[PDB]
Amino acid sequence: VDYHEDIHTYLREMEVKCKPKVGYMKKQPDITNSMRAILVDWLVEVGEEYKLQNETLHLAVNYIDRFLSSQENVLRGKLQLVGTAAMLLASKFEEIYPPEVAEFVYITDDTYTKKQVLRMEHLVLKVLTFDLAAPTVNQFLTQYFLHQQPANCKVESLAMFLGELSLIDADPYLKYLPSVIAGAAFHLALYTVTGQSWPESLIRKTGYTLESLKPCLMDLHQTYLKAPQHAQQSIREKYKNSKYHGVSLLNPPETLN
Amino acid sequence: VPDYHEDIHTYLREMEVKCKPKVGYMKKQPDITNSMRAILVDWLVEVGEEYKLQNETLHLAVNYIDRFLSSQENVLRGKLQLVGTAAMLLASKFEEIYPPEVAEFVYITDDTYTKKQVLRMEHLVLKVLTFDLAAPTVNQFLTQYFLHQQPANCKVESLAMFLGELSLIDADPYLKYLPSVIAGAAFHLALYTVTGQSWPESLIRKTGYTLESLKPCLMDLHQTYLKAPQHAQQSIREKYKNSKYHGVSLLNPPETLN
Amino acid sequence: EVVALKKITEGVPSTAIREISLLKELNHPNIVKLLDVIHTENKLYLVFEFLHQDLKKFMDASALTGIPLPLIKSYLFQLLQGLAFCHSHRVLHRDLKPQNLLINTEGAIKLADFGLARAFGVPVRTYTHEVVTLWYRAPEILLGCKYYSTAVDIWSLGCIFAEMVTRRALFPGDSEIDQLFRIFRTLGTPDEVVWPGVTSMPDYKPSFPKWARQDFSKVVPPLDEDGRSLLSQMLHYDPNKRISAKAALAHPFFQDVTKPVP
Amino acid sequence: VVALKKIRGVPSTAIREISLLKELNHPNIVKLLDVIHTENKLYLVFEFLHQDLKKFMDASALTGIPLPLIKSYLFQLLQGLAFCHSHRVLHRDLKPQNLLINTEGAIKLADFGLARAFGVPVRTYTHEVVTLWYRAPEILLGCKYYSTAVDIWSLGCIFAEMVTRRALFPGDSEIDQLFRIFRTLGTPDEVVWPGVTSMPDYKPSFPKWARQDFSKVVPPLDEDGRSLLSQMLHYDPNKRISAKAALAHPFFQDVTKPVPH
C-alpha cells in the first residue's frame, strides 16, 4: 500500500493503447526482425557506457517498435539513427541527468551529424504525438516484486534479466502485453532460484492464472535455455556483473513441471 | 487628388525590393527550364481569359511562381503545372470578387491532378511565401502612371498593359528589372508608338526615373515587341487583338526609338 | 502568455488569406498586433495580442453616464490615426463597428477584425457589393455605385462617433431601403447640387421622399460647434468631399486632446 | 478566444509537461487544449484562467480569503492531486504561483514543467526539486526515496498560508529551512520518525525544539481544520495522509462552492 491498485488498473488500460501491430516488419520492406535484434543489442551496450536505468532501454524499444509500425519505408542505413533518437527521447523523459546530444553523436563514430539526430528526434515525436508515458515490462515487474517480502534480490535481477531478453526477439514477443511477459518472467525467476510458483496474491491482483501465462512462459523458457547460443550477447554480458548478482551465470531449469 | 496616393506609391516602391527571386534561379533547378516556365505562363494567360479573371490576378500568380521556384529545390516537370494552378487559385482568392471553385482548377488540368493534390500544393506555396501575398506588380505601377495622361488615352493604356504582359513570359531578361522600372519602360514605349510623346516630366518628379535610367529595360522591351510575332508563346498577342483592348497587338511597332 | 487565438472543402478561405497578408504589413500603435501565424496541413492559427474588451461592451457598461467627452475625443483621435495608416498602406477595412474596436486598461483603442478588408488600387476598380454591417454602411454602397474606396471607412467612423455621444446607433435600419430612408430623415434627401451624379446611380429612384436636413444640435445635443462640424464632414453625401482620416486629425475639435484612462 | 500560450534539442521539461498533461483530464487540472509542433517552433495552448493564488492572496491582504472559500479550494486541490497520484504523476512544484483560479469559483493545478511519472516502488529521483519554502523535510535531509508525500507537504504549506496570509516556513537556505520547520513541529527523533538518525544529511548536533500547539500556528481554524493540517505536515512520509484519505476528513463534511470577488 492507497494508489498502488489504481496505478496497476491504469497501467493495464494504457498498455493496450501504446501498441504496435505484430505483423509490421513484413510490410517494412528493407528491414527484418534480424536487423532489429542487432540494434536492440547495441542500445544495451550504450545503456552500460552511460550508466542509464533499465526503464530508459524498455521505453526506447517501445518508441522504435511504434515508429516502424507507422512509417512506411525506413532504409536500413537510417535504422541506427532511429535508435539513437528513441534513446535520446527516453533519456530526456526518464533520467535525472540525460547524456548530452554530442555524446549520442560520439557513440555512432560520426555516422550521423548533430543536425540529423535533432531532425530524427522531431520526426519520432510527430509520429508518436508526444505519447511517451508507455507501460513497460520493467514497470509491471517492479509492482510484482512487492509480493515477495522480504525481497529476494536474486529473483529480482533474474526477472529483469529475462524481461530484457524478451526485447531482442520481435518474433515471438510482439504478440504478448508487457504485464504477461512480466508474469512469465517473475514465475520463471522464482521457480529457478527458490522452487516456488506464481503466488496466490499476484493471481488476485492481475486476475492471471498460471494457465493464462503458459503460452508466454514456454516461449521465455526456450529463449532462456538457448540464450548461450544467441547471436546477440550484450544482455548476458551485462548481468554477469555483481551489480545484478551474477544471475546470467545460473543454469536454467530443464523442465517446469 | 486624394492625400494618400503619394504615400501608397512610396510604400510600393519600398515593398517591391523585398518580394524578390534571384536572376537565373532556373540554373539551380535541374529538371525544369525558362522555356517550360514560358509555356506555363502563356497557359495561365489562357486560363485568365477562359474564366474572365483580372489582369492583376495574372500578375500576382507569376510573382508567386518565381518566388516559389527560387526557394524550393528539385521541382520536377510533372509538378510545374500544379505549382501554376495553386498560384492562380491563391491570387484568385486574394484579388477576385468571384474566384473560380477548386473544381474548376482541377477541370482545366483535365484530371492530371486530384482535388487533394491541389489543396496540398496551396498549403505548400503559402508555407514557402509565409502568407506575403500582397505583392507589388507592373500592373499596379502602370495604373498609377496612367493618371498622368491628361486627357485619358485608353488606346495607350491597352498597348502599355500588352507590353507589361509580354514581360511575364521571359524570365531572361525581365527578372533583372523591378516592376516600377518595367511599368516606366512599357508606358513610354506605348506613348511613343501610339502618340509620338515621351515619359512625361510629371512622372520624372514622381518616380525619380529619367528617360536615361529607363534605357536598359526599354531596349530589352523594344526587342520583345519587334520579335513578338515570331515567339513560340502567342496567347497574349491573341488576347490583345480584341476590341476590348482596341486591337493594339495588330499595331506596327516603331522600327527605332533613337 | 495571455493571447487572443483565432482557430480557422475549398482549402484556405479568402477571408483568412486577406486577413494575414494585410495585417502583417500594418505595424501601428492603434492596429491590433498579429504576433504569429501557426500553419500545418490540418490547422491554421492567428495569435493576436490580448486586449481587455471591445468598444460595444464598454458603451453598454457606461450606458448610465455615457463615455466622458474627453475619452470620446481621445478614442476618435486614435481611431483616425489607425485608419490613416491603413489608407496610407492601400488597405480598406470595410467592417468598422464598435464590436471590432478593442481597448486596454491604459486608455488605448485599436482597429481589429481585418477579415473583410482588401488591398485597393490607384485608381480603384469595382469591388464586392453589399459590404459593411447594415447600420454602418455608406450611401454609395446602398445606392449601388460602380466605385467606392477610403470614404466608406470614414462614414463608419462618423456613425461610431455619434453612437459614443448619444448612446444609441445613429441609423438602425432593418433592410437596404429602410437604412436609406433613416439616413435621408436626418441628413435630408440628397440632390444633384449637394451630390452631383446621385440621380444616375443604379438603385436610386425619383419616387424617393424629400425630407429637409435636421440641425445637428438636435441629432447630437452634447457636442459643441467644433464636434458638430467634424461629424457633418465625416457624414458628407459626396464621397469626393468627405474628409480624409489624415485631414480630420488636424480639425479644431482635437486641439485640446488628452489620453484619459477608462 | 482567449488562451494561455507557451513557445520556444526539444527540452526535457516540454517532453514531460506535454506527455503527462495530455493523459490528465480532470476539472481541477489545467486543460491542455492543443499542441502544434513545427521544424522551428513548439506551441502549448492551455485554457485561460483569470489569476494565480499568489496574486489573489495579496489582493485579499485586507480581509484574508474567507474560510468557506479556503475549504472549497483545498477540497478541489486535493481532488486534482488525488487524480495525479492515481495516474502515477508527481507535480513536485506546488506553490501559489502554479495554482490558477477562474471567476466561477474553481481552482486548478498548473505548470507540470518539473513533473514526472513514478514507478511503484519509487527510485532515487532529482536530488532537490521543490521551491525552498514548500519543500518537504525528507528532500532537505537528502533521503534516497521521495514520493506522493512531498506534494501533500507542499499543499499543507499552502493551506496554512491562505489562513494566516503569510508563508509558514520562509527559509533562506536548506539548513535554515529545517530550523524553521523544527521550531513549529518540534525536532524529530526515532519515536515520531523511525529513520531520521540514519539519513545522509542528518547530524547528532541538530538542536532541540518542543512541538508548538496549532491553536497558535493557525489560530482561526476549528478542531477539524487543525487535525487535517497536522495530518498533512506529519514528519514520517509513510504515515503522512494521502490526497484520497484527506477528502474523507470531517473538515469537509459541510463543503460548498463560494464565488470569489
XYZ file of N, CA and C in Angstrom, chain A residues 65-208:
432
model
N 9.626 0.368 -31.944
C 8.585 -0.561 -32.464
C 7.412 0.265 -33.012
N 6.938 1.259 -32.258
C 5.727 2.042 -32.621
C 6.025 2.897 -33.854
N 7.275 3.336 -34.010
C 7.726 4.205 -35.125
C 7.776 3.415 -36.438
N 8.202 2.147 -36.383
C 8.268 1.215 -37.549
C 6.867 0.678 -37.883
N 5.922 0.735 -36.940
C 4.502 0.349 -37.150
C 3.779 1.428 -37.970
N 4.324 2.656 -38.017
C 3.668 3.884 -38.550
C 4.302 4.326 -39.871
N 5.628 4.511 -39.889
C 6.392 4.995 -41.076
C 6.572 3.844 -42.076
N 6.426 4.157 -43.369
C 6.216 3.188 -44.478
C 7.554 2.552 -44.872
N 8.515 3.382 -45.290
C 9.809 2.950 -45.885
C 10.960 3.542 -45.068
N 11.512 2.742 -44.156
C 12.770 3.059 -43.421
C 13.904 2.295 -44.120
N 14.830 3.032 -44.751
C 16.092 2.487 -45.325
C 16.948 1.970 -44.165
N 17.606 0.822 -44.352
C 18.399 0.131 -43.299
C 19.553 1.034 -42.834
N 19.996 1.970 -43.679
C 21.049 2.951 -43.352
C 20.587 3.973 -42.326
N 19.266 4.145 -42.168
C 18.628 5.087 -41.205
C 18.306 4.380 -39.876
N 18.282 3.041 -39.850
C 17.756 2.244 -38.705
C 18.484 2.598 -37.402
N 19.781 2.919 -37.445
C 20.589 3.210 -36.226
C 20.305 4.642 -35.742
N 20.025 5.578 -36.659
C 19.650 6.988 -36.336
C 18.307 7.016 -35.586
N 17.340 6.199 -36.026
C 16.030 5.975 -35.344
C 16.309 5.572 -33.891
N 17.221 4.615 -33.702
C 17.584 4.061 -32.385
C 18.244 5.097 -31.497
N 19.111 5.939 -32.071
C 19.863 6.996 -31.342
C 18.878 8.034 -30.793
N 17.861 8.409 -31.578
C 16.842 9.426 -31.222
C 15.901 8.860 -30.157
N 15.368 7.661 -30.401
C 14.479 6.917 -29.475
C 15.103 6.904 -28.077
N 16.413 6.653 -27.999
C 17.163 6.533 -26.721
C 17.377 7.930 -26.128
N 17.594 8.937 -26.975
C 17.721 10.356 -26.551
C 16.402 10.807 -25.902
N 15.270 10.598 -26.583
C 13.909 10.915 -26.074
C 13.695 10.237 -24.712
N 13.912 8.919 -24.630
C 13.731 8.099 -23.403
C 14.609 8.642 -22.264
N 15.843 9.043 -22.563
C 16.777 9.627 -21.567
C 16.230 10.961 -21.036
N 15.596 11.763 -21.895
C 15.039 13.092 -21.529
C 13.822 12.885 -20.623
N 12.962 11.926 -20.964
C 11.781 11.542 -20.154
C 12.236 11.032 -18.780
N 13.200 10.098 -18.719
C 13.364 9.169 -17.562
C 14.615 9.455 -16.714
N 15.733 9.929 -17.271
C 16.998 10.107 -16.495
C 17.015 11.458 -15.771
N 17.666 11.499 -14.606
C 17.917 12.747 -13.822
C 18.792 13.684 -14.669
N 19.967 13.189 -15.086
C 20.976 13.877 -15.938
C 21.133 13.109 -17.251
N 20.364 13.443 -18.317
C 20.464 12.724 -19.590
C 21.769 13.065 -20.307
N 22.472 12.086 -20.926
C 23.687 12.379 -21.687
C 23.433 13.442 -22.763
N 24.436 14.294 -22.989
C 24.419 15.421 -23.956
C 24.193 14.875 -25.374
N 23.669 15.713 -26.273
C 23.446 15.399 -27.719
C 24.783 15.022 -28.380
N 25.874 15.716 -28.033
C 27.246 15.457 -28.534
C 27.665 14.025 -28.186
N 27.278 13.534 -27.001
C 27.571 12.150 -26.532
C 26.890 11.131 -27.451
N 25.643 11.392 -27.867
C 24.825 10.494 -28.733
C 25.383 10.484 -30.166
N 26.165 11.504 -30.545
C 26.965 11.527 -31.809
C 28.186 10.616 -31.625
N 28.972 10.865 -30.571
C 30.253 10.178 -30.247
C 30.120 8.651 -30.361
N 28.963 8.069 -30.025
C 28.780 6.586 -29.975
C 28.450 6.026 -31.366
N 28.016 6.855 -32.320
C 27.781 6.434 -33.730
C 29.109 6.439 -34.505
N 30.173 7.004 -33.914
C 31.518 7.223 -34.522
C 31.380 8.191 -35.704
N 30.502 9.189 -35.562
C 30.237 10.248 -36.571
C 29.686 9.608 -37.852
N 28.831 8.586 -37.710
C 27.972 8.034 -38.793
C 26.992 9.127 -39.225
N 26.231 9.653 -38.259
C 25.259 10.763 -38.428
C 25.780 12.001 -37.684
N 25.505 13.189 -38.229
C 25.857 14.511 -37.641
C 24.825 14.887 -36.570
N 25.051 16.001 -35.864
C 24.118 16.554 -34.843
C 22.796 16.935 -35.520
N 22.866 17.708 -36.606
C 21.691 18.143 -37.408
C 20.734 16.957 -37.596
N 21.258 15.803 -38.022
C 20.460 14.624 -38.458
C 19.735 13.990 -37.267
N 20.322 14.047 -36.068
C 19.770 13.399 -34.839
C 18.617 14.260 -34.305
N 18.805 15.587 -34.248
C 17.760 16.569 -33.841
C 16.596 16.508 -34.838
N 16.896 16.310 -36.123
C 15.884 16.177 -37.206
C 15.084 14.879 -37.021
N 15.752 13.759 -36.712
C 15.108 12.430 -36.493
C 14.327 12.432 -35.169
N 14.813 13.160 -34.156
C 14.093 13.357 -32.868
C 12.702 13.905 -33.185
N 12.657 15.052 -33.869
C 11.415 15.765 -34.265
C 10.441 14.790 -34.948
N 10.918 14.018 -35.929
C 10.073 13.120 -36.766
C 9.405 12.069 -35.871
N 10.171 11.469 -34.949
C 9.678 10.452 -33.971
C 8.542 11.066 -33.131
N 8.772 12.246 -32.534
C 7.810 12.946 -31.633
C 6.502 13.256 -32.377
N 6.590 13.616 -33.660
C 5.415 13.888 -34.534
C 4.643 12.576 -34.742
N 5.342 11.495 -35.068
C 4.724 10.168 -35.361
C 4.013 9.642 -34.104
N 4.663 9.710 -32.937
C 4.124 9.182 -31.649
C 3.133 10.172 -31.017
N 3.236 11.464 -31.362
C 2.339 12.574 -30.918
C 2.546 12.831 -29.416
N 3.802 12.769 -28.965
C 4.249 13.056 -27.576
C 3.675 12.028 -26.584
N 3.168 10.893 -27.060
C 2.619 9.833 -26.175
C 3.798 8.957 -25.737
N 4.585 9.433 -24.765
C 5.912 8.878 -24.373
C 5.849 8.145 -23.020
N 4.718 8.218 -22.308
C 4.498 7.578 -20.985
C 3.910 6.174 -21.182
N 4.681 5.296 -21.827
C 4.296 3.910 -22.179
C 4.581 2.988 -20.998
N 3.629 2.098 -20.640
C 3.905 0.999 -19.719
C 4.969 0.031 -20.254
N 5.870 -0.420 -19.388
C 6.969 -1.362 -19.723
C 6.829 -2.648 -18.901
N 7.519 -3.693 -19.343
C 7.687 -4.970 -18.594
C 8.309 -4.649 -17.232
N 9.319 -3.770 -17.242
C 10.055 -3.250 -16.060
C 9.064 -2.674 -15.031
N 8.120 -1.819 -15.438
C 7.140 -1.167 -14.514
C 6.237 -2.215 -13.840
N 5.836 -3.264 -14.566
C 4.958 -4.357 -14.063
C 5.760 -5.263 -13.115
N 7.001 -5.615 -13.481
C 7.934 -6.424 -12.642
C 8.083 -5.781 -11.266
N 8.392 -4.488 -11.264
C 8.632 -3.637 -10.071
C 7.414 -3.724 -9.137
N 6.211 -3.806 -9.697
C 4.964 -3.978 -8.909
C 4.880 -5.397 -8.335
N 5.187 -6.426 -9.130
C 5.077 -7.845 -8.697
C 6.053 -8.109 -7.533
N 7.267 -7.547 -7.582
C 8.343 -7.773 -6.580
C 7.826 -7.539 -5.160
N 6.907 -6.582 -4.974
C 6.380 -6.201 -3.634
C 5.610 -7.364 -2.974
N 5.290 -8.436 -3.708
C 4.555 -9.617 -3.182
C 5.526 -10.715 -2.713
N 6.843 -10.558 -2.905
C 7.886 -11.351 -2.187
C 8.507 -10.471 -1.098
N 8.049 -10.640 0.155
C 8.552 -9.948 1.381
C 9.265 -10.964 2.277
N 10.496 -10.681 2.776
C 11.337 -9.611 2.238
C 11.733 -9.965 0.795
N 12.182 -8.963 0.042
C 12.602 -9.106 -1.368
C 13.677 -10.193 -1.437
N 13.631 -11.033 -2.470
C 14.768 -11.889 -2.885
C 15.451 -11.187 -4.067
N 16.601 -10.551 -3.827
C 17.376 -9.768 -4.829
C 17.750 -10.627 -6.046
N 18.020 -11.916 -5.835
C 18.485 -12.854 -6.892
C 17.342 -13.115 -7.883
N 16.116 -13.231 -7.362
C 14.867 -13.393 -8.159
C 14.608 -12.101 -8.948
N 14.755 -10.943 -8.305
C 14.523 -9.611 -8.930
C 15.439 -9.463 -10.157
N 16.754 -9.582 -9.967
C 17.785 -9.448 -11.033
C 17.573 -10.467 -12.162
N 17.223 -11.720 -11.853
C 16.969 -12.776 -12.879
C 15.671 -12.470 -13.641
N 14.646 -11.915 -12.987
C 13.387 -11.495 -13.651
C 13.674 -10.348 -14.622
N 14.469 -9.367 -14.181
C 14.890 -8.222 -15.028
C 15.707 -8.760 -16.212
N 16.635 -9.687 -15.955
C 17.460 -10.366 -16.984
C 16.552 -10.934 -18.082
N 15.549 -11.724 -17.694
C 14.628 -12.455 -18.608
C 13.696 -11.486 -19.341
N 13.213 -10.443 -18.659
C 12.396 -9.381 -19.278
C 13.178 -8.668 -20.371
N 14.455 -8.381 -20.117
C 15.365 -7.695 -21.072
C 15.663 -8.617 -22.268
N 15.695 -9.934 -22.064
C 15.901 -10.912 -23.166
C 14.706 -10.890 -24.133
N 13.489 -10.646 -23.645
C 12.246 -10.562 -24.465
C 12.308 -9.420 -25.499
N 13.096 -8.368 -25.243
C 13.181 -7.150 -26.096
C 13.863 -7.464 -27.441
N 14.701 -8.508 -27.513
C 15.572 -8.799 -28.693
C 14.731 -9.416 -29.816
N 13.816 -10.328 -29.471
C 13.129 -11.251 -30.423
C 11.673 -10.799 -30.638
N 11.463 -9.874 -31.584
C 10.131 -9.410 -32.050
C 9.203 -10.619 -32.225
N 9.637 -11.607 -33.016
C 9.046 -12.971 -33.074
C 9.737 -13.802 -31.993
N 9.055 -14.250 -30.910
C 7.600 -14.135 -30.764
C 6.990 -13.033 -29.871
N 7.786 -12.169 -29.229
C 7.333 -11.414 -28.019
C 6.393 -10.245 -28.364
N 6.241 -9.867 -29.632
C 5.372 -8.714 -30.005
C 3.889 -9.031 -29.767
N 3.502 -10.310 -29.669
C 2.075 -10.719 -29.551
C 1.715 -11.017 -28.088
N 2.516 -10.521 -27.140
C 2.247 -10.537 -25.674
C 2.350 -9.114 -25.112
N 1.398 -8.771 -24.240
C 1.371 -7.499 -23.471
C 2.503 -7.493 -22.446
N 3.053 -6.307 -22.130
C 4.061 -6.184 -21.080
C 3.699 -6.920 -19.777
N 2.472 -6.763 -19.275
C 2.030 -7.382 -17.997
C 2.202 -8.909 -18.053
N 1.970 -9.538 -19.210
C 2.052 -11.022 -19.402
C 3.531 -11.464 -19.387
N 4.409 -10.761 -20.097
C 5.850 -11.134 -20.149
C 6.422 -11.004 -18.731
N 5.989 -9.996 -17.967
C 6.437 -9.733 -16.578
C 6.017 -10.907 -15.689
N 4.777 -11.377 -15.847
C 4.233 -12.552 -15.137
C 5.051 -13.798 -15.425
N 5.250 -14.112 -16.711
C 6.070 -15.246 -17.196
C 7.508 -15.145 -16.670
N 8.084 -13.944 -16.666
C 9.491 -13.691 -16.283
C 9.672 -13.869 -14.776
N 8.733 -13.364 -13.980
C 8.779 -13.435 -12.496
C 8.615 -14.890 -12.022
N 7.617 -15.615 -12.540
C 7.392 -17.048 -12.211
C 8.633 -17.875 -12.593
N 9.248 -17.601 -13.748
C 10.441 -18.357 -14.231
C 11.620 -18.096 -13.282
N 11.866 -16.832 -12.919
C 12.895 -16.392 -11.942
C 12.656 -17.053 -10.580
N 11.425 -16.988 -10.083
C 11.019 -17.501 -8.748
C 11.249 -19.016 -8.676
N 10.901 -19.742 -9.739
C 10.996 -21.226 -9.796
C 12.473 -21.644 -9.865
N 13.332 -20.966 -10.630
C 14.752 -21.392 -10.785
C 15.554 -21.155 -9.500
N 15.245 -20.105 -8.733
C 16.049 -19.680 -7.545
C 15.549 -20.381 -6.270
N 14.229 -20.530 -6.089
C 13.594 -20.938 -4.802
C 12.692 -22.177 -4.947
N 12.294 -22.544 -6.174
C 11.393 -23.678 -6.464
C 9.919 -23.329 -6.296
N 9.604 -22.065 -6.004
C 8.229 -21.564 -5.717
C 7.557 -21.155 -7.034
N 6.236 -20.970 -7.003
C 5.395 -20.696 -8.199
C 4.674 -19.346 -8.071
N 4.195 -18.822 -9.201
C 3.330 -17.619 -9.331
C 2.343 -17.569 -8.164
N 2.516 -16.652 -7.187
C 1.769 -16.721 -5.928
C 0.288 -16.297 -5.989
N -0.494 -16.743 -4.997
C -1.966 -16.523 -4.888
C -2.287 -15.015 -4.900
N -1.518 -14.185 -4.191
C -1.737 -12.715 -4.110
C -1.631 -12.067 -5.507
N -0.658 -12.462 -6.336
C -0.473 -11.909 -7.707
C -1.516 -12.474 -8.691
N -2.133 -13.623 -8.386
C -3.322 -14.165 -9.118
C -4.544 -13.282 -8.800
N -4.715 -12.874 -7.537
C -5.820 -11.980 -7.090
C -5.632 -10.588 -7.709
N -4.393 -10.082 -7.730
C -4.028 -8.721 -8.218
C -4.281 -8.605 -9.727
N -3.717 -9.518 -10.522
C -3.641 -9.445 -12.008
C -4.837 -10.148 -12.662
N -5.490 -11.067 -11.941
C -6.515 -11.981 -12.481
C -5.934 -13.012 -13.443
N -4.604 -13.094 -13.565
C -3.877 -14.110 -14.374
C -3.653 -15.381 -13.542
